[PDB]
Design an enzyme around this catalytic site. Structure first.
Site, short mmCIF file in Angstrom:
data_model
loop_
_atom_site.label_atom_id
_atom_site.label_comp_id
_atom_site.label_asym_id
_atom_site.label_seq_id
_atom_site.Cartn_x
_atom_site.Cartn_y
_atom_site.Cartn_z
N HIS A 80 0.82 -1.24 0.00
CA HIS A 80 0.00 0.00 0.00
C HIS A 80 0.85 1.29 0.00
O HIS A 80 0.68 2.16 0.80
CB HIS A 80 -0.98 -0.09 1.15
CG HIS A 80 -2.12 -0.99 0.86
ND1 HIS A 80 -2.24 -2.19 1.49
CD2 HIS A 80 -3.18 -0.84 0.01
CE1 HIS A 80 -3.38 -2.76 1.12
NE2 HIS A 80 -3.98 -1.93 0.17
N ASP A 132 -5.10 5.62 -1.37
CA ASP A 132 -4.56 4.88 -0.18
C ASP A 132 -3.60 5.79 0.61
O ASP A 132 -2.75 5.26 1.36
CB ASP A 132 -3.85 3.62 -0.63
CG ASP A 132 -4.76 2.41 -0.74
OD1 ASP A 132 -5.77 2.29 0.01
OD2 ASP A 132 -4.41 1.55 -1.52
N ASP A 179 -8.07 -0.75 -8.51
CA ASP A 179 -7.47 -1.16 -7.23
C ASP A 179 -6.98 -2.59 -7.26
O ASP A 179 -6.01 -2.89 -6.54
CB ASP A 179 -8.46 -0.91 -6.12
CG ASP A 179 -7.75 -0.80 -4.79
OD1 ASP A 179 -6.49 -0.54 -4.77
OD2 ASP A 179 -8.48 -0.85 -3.82
N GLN A 239 -5.93 -17.60 -3.43
CA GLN A 239 -5.96 -16.81 -4.67
C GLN A 239 -7.10 -17.28 -5.58
O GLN A 239 -7.84 -16.36 -6.10
CB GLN A 239 -4.57 -16.78 -5.33
CG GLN A 239 -3.56 -15.91 -4.58
CD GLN A 239 -3.92 -14.45 -4.66
OE1 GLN A 239 -4.07 -13.85 -5.73
NE2 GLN A 239 -4.23 -13.89 -3.50
C1 LIG Z 1 -4.47 -7.65 -5.84
C2 LIG Z 1 -4.94 -8.51 -4.73
N1 LIG Z 1 -5.88 -8.01 -3.95
C3 LIG Z 1 -6.14 -8.92 -3.04
C4 LIG Z 1 -7.07 -8.96 -1.98
C5 LIG Z 1 -7.04 -10.11 -1.23
C6 LIG Z 1 -8.08 -10.18 -0.09
F1 LIG Z 1 -9.04 -9.25 -0.26
F2 LIG Z 1 -8.68 -11.43 -0.05
F3 LIG Z 1 -7.52 -9.96 1.11
C7 LIG Z 1 -6.15 -11.24 -1.50
C8 LIG Z 1 -6.04 -12.52 -0.63
C9 LIG Z 1 -6.95 -13.63 -1.23
C10 LIG Z 1 -6.96 -14.70 -0.21
N2 LIG Z 1 -5.91 -15.33 0.26
C11 LIG Z 1 -6.53 -16.18 1.17
N3 LIG Z 1 -5.80 -16.99 2.00
C12 LIG Z 1 -4.45 -17.36 1.54
C13 LIG Z 1 -4.11 -18.61 2.30
C14 LIG Z 1 -5.28 -18.89 3.22
C15 LIG Z 1 -6.50 -18.09 2.67
N4 LIG Z 1 -7.79 -16.11 1.33
N5 LIG Z 1 -8.13 -15.17 0.40
C16 LIG Z 1 -9.54 -14.72 0.13
N6 LIG Z 1 -5.28 -11.19 -2.43
N7 LIG Z 1 -5.32 -10.03 -3.19
C17 LIG Z 1 -4.53 -9.76 -4.33
C18 LIG Z 1 -3.46 -10.76 -4.77
MG LIG Z 2 -7.35 1.07 0.21
ZN LIG Z 3 -5.50 0.49 -3.09
#
Ligand SMILES: Cc1nc2cc(C(F)(F)F)c(CCc3nc(N4CCCC4)nn3C)nn2c1C
Ligand SMILES: [Mg+2]
Ligand SMILES: [Zn+2]
Length: 312
Positions: A67, A106, A216, A268
């Site tokens: 961020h 941000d 975003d 992912q």
């Molecule tokens: C551009 C970008 N933006 C975001 C936003 C998020 C989120 F919003 F979900 F946080 C994520 C994380 C997605 C994710 N990972 C997992 N865990 C990993 C291992 C156990 C469970 N659960 N979830 C839902 N990646 N992400 C990216 C790469």
């Molecule tokens: Mg934000």
């Molecule tokens: Zn952002």
């Protein structure tokens, strides 16, 4: 007058949705000015005021893994690419407002989620009970706009000024992913029942909110190596938040628990199916020329599938 110009590879690739702004931090301001000049005009902003505003914005982004200032300029480039591929759909004020909104969205992020601020009981969580960081980011944006020599909007009327600041406010609030789900359902329903009306201000607002989510998240729409190395920065923040939850005596959710490193490929997939693909699908329905964002997202989803099958 003084046109900004880029080396040839950058001049061509900056027009594509998948452009990476590169590791040379000192070129990011020039890349942004380039994008304002082409999507808005050399007339939109006084060069000196705009430069002074960009550098104060940069200074108010912190040195966190994800961020950070690079994220700000990345989100602004995706918006540039949406605007340039949908020339005639946007007002002059929207062109002005949305690149600034994206650069600012941000501001002064600390690398922690709204949820963590509420559990830590940070002062910002008493000042702003929902969209905590996003109300902060807009508050930091107004701060900087009011420094001397920083009013890039000084040539607008009181009412044009109030409208641009209102576009920026809503665009920044919309980057709160908690709000995205319901916004995309409404847009999906309006698109499908043919009620979607871009002369209706509350409809435009929803469309701009979805564009904001799309810009975003645009890290999921890059070349695979960019996508994959960004995901490392994203998790480096989430895992530090998880550590901070464990220090408050709270088992973090698996997304934030570095002990669950192994499950990242599958987290992912859920994220691409639950958030990303639906985001770029509805965006493509409403703005057909943004389809390269959907096609890149689907290419990266299939790369995470290969990681789970042990082929990557
Ligand atoms: C551009 C970008 N933006 C975001 C936003 C998020 C989120 F919003 F979900 F946080 C994520 C994380 C997605 C994710 N990972 C997992 N865990 C990993 C291992 C156990 C469970 N659960 N979830 C839902 N990646 N992400 C990216 C790469
Ligand atoms: Mg934000
Ligand atoms: Zn952002």
């Amino acid at each position: 007058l003084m046109q900004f110009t880029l080396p040839v590879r950058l001049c061509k690739e900056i027009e594509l949705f998948h452009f990476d702004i590169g590791p040379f931090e000192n070129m990011w301001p020039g890349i942004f000015v380039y994008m304002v000049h082409r999507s808005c005009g050399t007339s939109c902003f006084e060069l000196e005021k705009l430069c002074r505003f960009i550098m104060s914005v940069k200074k108010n982004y912190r040195r966190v893994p994800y961020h950070n200032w690079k994220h700000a300029v990345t989100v602004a480039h995706c918006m540039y690419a949406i605007l340039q591929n949908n020339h005639t759909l946007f007002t002059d004020l929207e062109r002005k407002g949305l690149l600034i909104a994206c650069l600012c969205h941000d501001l002064d992020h600390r690398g922690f989620s709204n949820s963590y601020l509420q559990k830590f009981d940070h002062p910002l969580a008493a000042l702003y009970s929902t969209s905590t960081m996003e109300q902060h980011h807009f508050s930091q944006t107004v701060s900087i706009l009011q420094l001397e020599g920083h009013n890039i909007f000084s040539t607008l009327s009181s009412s044009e000024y109030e409208q641009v600041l209102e576009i920026i406010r809503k665009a920044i609030i919309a980057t709160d992913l908690a709000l995205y789900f319901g916004n995309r359902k409404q847009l999906e329903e309006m698109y499908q029942t043919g009620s979607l009306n871009l002369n209706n201000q509350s409809h435009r607002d929803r469309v701009i909110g979805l564009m904001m989510t799309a810009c975003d998240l645009c890290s999921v729409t890059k070349l695979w190596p960019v996508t994959k190395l960004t995901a490392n920065d994203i998790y480096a923040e989430f895992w530090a938040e998880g550590d901070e939850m464990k220090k408050l005596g709270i088992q973090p959710i698996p997304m934030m628990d570095r002990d669950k490193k192994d499950e990242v490929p599958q987290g992912q997939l859920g994220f691409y199916n639950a958030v990303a693909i639906p985001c770029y699908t509805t965006l493509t329905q409403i703005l057909p020329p943004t389809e390269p964002l959907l096609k890149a997202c689907r290419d990266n989803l299939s790369q995470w599938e290969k990681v789970i099958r042990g082929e990557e």
